[PDB]
Design a protein around this ligand. Structure first.
Ligand SMILES: [Zn+2]
Length: 651
């Protein structure tokens, strides 16, 4: 059963760990130790998303598990949904829309609930009462004007002070850009990531950094991570993988950002190990300035059979770059060579739990990828969990135009959808090269939208190529039409189920899909390439010429590749704001009404399996078992009890 529970706008799913039982005992132990190092870092993300998140959580968790009143009352059920969303979003803000949750319960209820809870169980400071803890946390929860956005990206506002994230403390956005612009090296051909694993604070009167390391900030959790990484080091598969674990331990112990670059080099060079993992401060989407990286972790092992399709996409990387529809001046003379593979996720943690991604391209250091290479991974068991949970839910029966399209989607939608993700992560982000002297940050806050659009267009253009039929990546030349329809139907229409009524598209991913869909829709109107007809009051997206759709994909890819490589900022502003922002209220209200009858949640998340060490009668380890019988509430409460080593307050 891939469906666990559904609440609010969130749906909890499960995923299997296929072929885990076939691993050796030394591999199962290495997986176990890496998964343990992953789970210990859950508290690190909560504190990064807000200085009150660890206190608001442990307060609600103490009230939830010790509530004495009627547990079937609307006040308790609405508090239960609130706590579940804080668990899902690793904070009090929406994981996708960045807006703060609105409590569906009164303050008088929570006040009497806190006072009715044992004061010893609440996250009280030294010599603090439950009243003082309520007076400080209630305005954070109930006042809509306090910490309204976890990540702000509005013009004319101090993005550091208007963001509820806890990456800066007592520092203005002007003082942060000047702080790193100064330590910005000039003639440095291998620039370190500056301020990646630290909190920029103003202790006393100086502007300094509190590095996240052993003996420093977040040391209570990092000591646990290093402990399990040392255990994983003793059962490493080979010396290349062992050096990766050892160098990562040094990065945690010293906080040296130079060791992180050395770790990223060794991690890229470890291509032959079956078991791989990510554990550290990786992606910087949580920072409004984009400099600090949130903590995430992923433990996986190579999917041997599924990797052979992604190794054909990699061995033909020069073919896809040469036959690209972009201008010849933007094509790379020789591809950098990306090591692409399909992985089976063993566990999720940090910013990858419970809401995770299906494809990751690392490292982020631009110079490390050029001189040493990158690793592109596709998570097969998560994509499989998405499909089998959505199989037969009747979402396509409601929004697809005709039954003849549904039959093609049911046959090739999973394959071409999974194959499009392979092209996106392994070749979409890596392909193309900027013109000499063009600022890589010339698109400003439009780079994230244009980059994902450029990668989606690369996957869409080539998933239809007749070479993938020659390379036996698709069973026939009609398979791409399933992915083309679902992408257009989602961008033009069905993705609005994730939008609040009266709002526009704000998130970067949802923007590039609508940008690609509406651009092809407008430019294909004279030939009726894509239509949006209505039948009995229901609007359907109709595709009439799938070949012309591909040509329009190439034209938009050539124009987007030109905008990125030449740094045309105002050109990207025209594209993103004219196609990827406006939402039709009449269509949006129609889609929501049709969607509500399906009883589906637009956002998905996964709960991790449960790994157990099997010991003999004398203490030695004989097996490592994996279970899938735990539920959402049980797992979050267990992680809060056994994998929560950080204090409630970290300033
Ligand atoms: Zn991507």
């Amino acid at each position: 059963d891939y469906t666990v529970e559904q609440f609010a706008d969130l749906q909890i799913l499960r995923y299997k760990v296929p072929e885990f039982e076939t691993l050796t005992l030394k591999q199962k132990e290495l997986v176990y130790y890496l998964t343990q190092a992953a789970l210990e870092g859950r508290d690190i993300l909560f504190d990064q998303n807000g200085k009150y998140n660890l206190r608001i959580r442990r307060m609600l968790e103490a009230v939830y598990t010790n509530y004495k009143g009627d547990k079937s009352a609307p006040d308790f059920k609405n508090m239960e949904v609130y706590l579940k969303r804080v668990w899902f979003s690793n904070g009090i803000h929406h994981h996708y829309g960045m807006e703060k949750f609105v409590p569906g319960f009164s303050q008088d209820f929570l006040k009497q609930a806190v006072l009715g809870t044992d004061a010893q169980l609440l996250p009280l400071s030294e010599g603090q009462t439950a009243e003082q803890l309520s007076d400080e946390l209630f305005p954070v929860m109930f006042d809509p004007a306090i910490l309204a956005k976890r990540v702000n990206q509005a013009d004319g506002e101090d993005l550091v002070l208007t963001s509820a994230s806890n990456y800066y403390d007592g520092v203005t956005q002007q003082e942060a850009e000047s702080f790193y612009g100064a330590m910005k090296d000039p003639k440095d051909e291998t620039p370190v990531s500056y301020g990646l694993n630290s909190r920029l604070v103003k202790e006393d009167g100086k502007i300094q950094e509190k590095v996240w390391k052993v003996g420093g900030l977040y040391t209570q959790a990092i000591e646990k991570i290093v402990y399990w990484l040392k255990k994983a080091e003793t059962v490493a598969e080979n010396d290349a993988q062992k050096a990766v674990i050892s160098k990562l331990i040094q990065f945690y112990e010293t906080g040296s950002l130079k060791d992180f670059d050395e770790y990223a080099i060794l991690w890229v060079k470890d291509l032959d190990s079956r078991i791989d993992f990510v554990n550290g401060f990786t992606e910087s989407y949580g920072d409004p300035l984009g400099v600090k990286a949130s903590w995430e972790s992923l433990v996986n092992f190579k999917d041997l059979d599924a990797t052979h399709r992604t190794e054909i996409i990699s061995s033909n990387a020069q073919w896809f770059e040469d036959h690209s529809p972009v201008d010849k001046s933007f094509k790379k003379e020789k591809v950098k060579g990306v090591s692409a593979k399909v992985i089976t996720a063993a566990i999720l943690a940090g910013d990858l739990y419970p809401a995770t991604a299906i494809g990751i391209n690392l490292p982020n250091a631009n110079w490390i990828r050029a001189h040493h290479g990158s690793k592109s991974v596709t998570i097969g068991n998560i994509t499989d969990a998405y499909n089998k949970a959505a199989h037969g839910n009747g979402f396509n029966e409601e929004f697809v135009s005709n039954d003849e399209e549904r039959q093609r989607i049911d046959q090739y939608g999973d394959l071409t959808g999974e194959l499009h993700t392979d092209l996106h992560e392994s070749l979409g982000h890596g392909s193309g090269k900027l013109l000499p002297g063009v600022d890589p940050d010339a698109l400003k806050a439009y780079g994230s939208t244009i980059e994902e659009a450029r990668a989606d267009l690369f996957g869409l253009y080539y998933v239809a190529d007749p070479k993938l039929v020659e390379l036996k990546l698709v069973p026939d030349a009609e398979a791409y039409k399933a992915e083309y329809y679902t992408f257009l139907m989602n961008g033009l229409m069905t993705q609005l189920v994730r939008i609040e009524p009266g709002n526009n598209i704000e998130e970067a991913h949802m923007r590039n899909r609508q940008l690609i869909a509406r651009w092809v829709f407008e430019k294909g109107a004279p030939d009726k390439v894509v239509e949006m007809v209505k039948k009995d009051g229901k609007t359907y997206v109709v595709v009439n010429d799938y070949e012309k759709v591909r040509q329009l994909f190439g034209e938009l890819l050539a124009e987007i590749q030109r905008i990125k490589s030449t740094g045309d900022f105002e050109g990207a502003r025209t594209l993103v704001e004219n196609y990827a922002v406006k939402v039709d209220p009449a269509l949006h209200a129609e889609v929501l009404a049709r969607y509500k009858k399906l009883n589906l949640a637009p956002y998905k998340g996964f709960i991790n399996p449960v790994y157990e060490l099997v010991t003999d009668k004398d203490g030695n380890i004989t097996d490592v078992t994996v279970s899938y019988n735990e539920d959402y509430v049980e797992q979050m409460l267990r992680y809060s009890k056994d994998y929560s080593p950080l204090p409630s307050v970290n300033n």
